[PDB]
Symmetry: C2
């Protein structure tokens, strides 16, 4: 019972269909690079201006007021899942995302909630999704999301960011059983969470495996890939059994060049790419079935609007007009110019039409 | 006038020749994972126990006393070059490597020394190399090293580590001219420094492009690759003109999967690989001319000695007995077990012989 979708270009491209132009959106489009974002977020702490449906809806809508983006992504945080699982977060302005008491011993898994009860703990996200879907009034599709099991595990074990994931990877090598146990707990929580996002109104889903690069092919296929496959399989099944139509699912593995081939067979309609993988080579790895997403170096936006136009033109030529959704290789950075983001969006639309006409 | 080399396996493998077994060494073999390393380094600050020839020689020799490594690498720091260029470092125990006053404006380049005078500022490194070469008494070859121009630039602009290199990459996009100027200054300083290391006794050289991954193919070919090529070209030329025999040169580009093909044509005998690139695929990218180096996930050493043996066996099978030097995909970590490092070394020797016999 939601408004009928007016612009569905992003969805058609996601399913592999031909479109009049290439649809585009930006990871972190609702982010600190927007002055209005900082003001709204300054209402209260992170997990308060995030637990408010109206606040998330407003943040989600802000970028769409500045740029004709072909999709909106619900504003939230990947860390909401580990939190709903029972872990305490202490979001500070300096460090940012942080778990003061990380998982380090196998025994630490005992403090986690049964993954079956996580969806009920994340009701505020569902409310924000329904509210945003209503307010968007069918302008463009609404993307729902969550972090992949491995990536969520790294935050839970490391306690935050890391340039090596040494503690998390030590778990994989020294505690393989406990690692699989944690990864399964995360999977069993993500499935009902993602299904709930669609029930609440999400029209597409993206699984963020932001810390894929720290693993090599072998560890990835052993600890990340199985669960990435399981998420898509179980979400699709539960949606069908509930009488709902499955939505297109995207798998983004940052620094996951080595896993592109497996990811194209993981049960996702779209495979997101970071900027280090050449578009043509990515096309080779994935095949001709799946849709590819993104890829411009987010830092490319520091260049002039004219230079951004040329970089976008070159990117579109490599990807080709078929099975492609434009985006950056990673999320927008806090110090980027909103005007340069607009130039990126406008360039994709302009050149994608010229590439067709 | 140095001792004649007894075990030259690493050098023969470096030039592409067949060997009785696969030679092996570890990046950071002289590192905090060794108790004896912490004690020696605790003599004074970083740039004091580093400016002492006897101290560096001792640190270089420590790992060789524990393991039958096929090469030794002089103990030093990649940051010695920017320092010799005129930048002040404030090495603290918490943060580690740091420039309190980083380069941020083009005008900041004016405080740097003429690259022609850098080698004279790095005499202590040359003294340590000669001393180590003498004390090694020809047991195994001595590797000299330096950081690549782009990687050195990131430290100079960022002021230290970074997960995005946003400031350094902003220089590439907004200040392309100043970026090329800085990269050229770094190249003109590295050449005489590396040549001096060989004159002092280095038998091989490795250029560390540790921050290659932050750049995509386009930026890499524009700002990193040209200078990487220039270093090898000019070092070889200066060595020949001085009557010395050029030494085998290694190019290590961490997270540089996208540049393996160009790197194999950059004028280096060896191309070092991080653990995310599958050996067979790396072989495809580089060709059949160059020698490949390393690759085991340093974190693999957290696994049991028996498991490490199996992981090593699998790695050697993928690489094959020809044109290969075993090593890790990156430097050893501070919390790793010296006994596990020994197991890595022993496994390479054992399995490489079985792979031949």
């Amino acid at each position: 019972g939601f408004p009928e979708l007016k612009n569905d270009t992003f969805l058609r491209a996601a399913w592999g269909e031909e479109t009049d132009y290439t649809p585009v959106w930006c990871m972190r489009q609702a982010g600190r690079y927007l002055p209005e974002f900082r003001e709204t977020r300054a209402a209260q702490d992170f997990f308060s201006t995030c637990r408010s449906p109206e606040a998330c809806c407003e943040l989600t809508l802000q970028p769409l007021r500045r740029f004709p983006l072909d999709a909106a992504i619900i504003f939230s945080d990947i860390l909401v899942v580990p939190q709903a699982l029972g872990m305490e977060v202490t979001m500070v302005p300096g460090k940012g995302p942080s778990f003061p008491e990380p998982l380090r011993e196998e025994q630490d898994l005992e403090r986690l909630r049964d993954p079956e009860v996580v969806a009920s703990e994340l009701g505020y996200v569902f409310q924000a999704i329904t509210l945003t879907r209503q307010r968007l009034a069918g302008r463009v599709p609404l993307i729902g999301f969550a972090g992949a099991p491995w990536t969520l595990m790294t935050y839970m074990v490391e306690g935050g960011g890391s340039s090596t994931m040494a503690q998390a990877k030590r778990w994989l090598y020294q505690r393989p059983q406990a690692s699989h146990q944690l990864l399964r707990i995360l999977t069993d929580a993500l499935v009902p969470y993602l299904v709930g996002q669609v029930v609440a109104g999400a029209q597409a889903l993206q699984l963020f495996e932001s810390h894929a690069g720290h693993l090599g092919p072998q560890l990835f296929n052993k600890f990340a890939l199985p669960y990435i496959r399981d998420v898509a399989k179980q979400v699709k099944a539960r949606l069908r059994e509930a009488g709902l139509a499955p939505v297109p699912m995207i798998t983004f593995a940052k620094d996951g060049h080595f896993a592109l081939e497996e990811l194209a067979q993981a049960g996702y309609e779209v495979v997101g790419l970071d900027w280090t993988v050449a578009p043509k080579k990515a096309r080779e790895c994935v095949g001709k079935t799946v849709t590819l997403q993104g890829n411009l170096d987010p830092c490319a936006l520091y260049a002039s609007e004219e230079e951004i136009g040329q970089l976008v033109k070159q990117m579109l030529d490599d990807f080709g007009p078929h099975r492609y959704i434009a985006n950056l290789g990673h999320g927008l950075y806090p110090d980027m110019d909103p005007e340069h983001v607009g130039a990126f969006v406008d360039a994709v639309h302009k050149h994608s039409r010229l590439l067709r006409q």
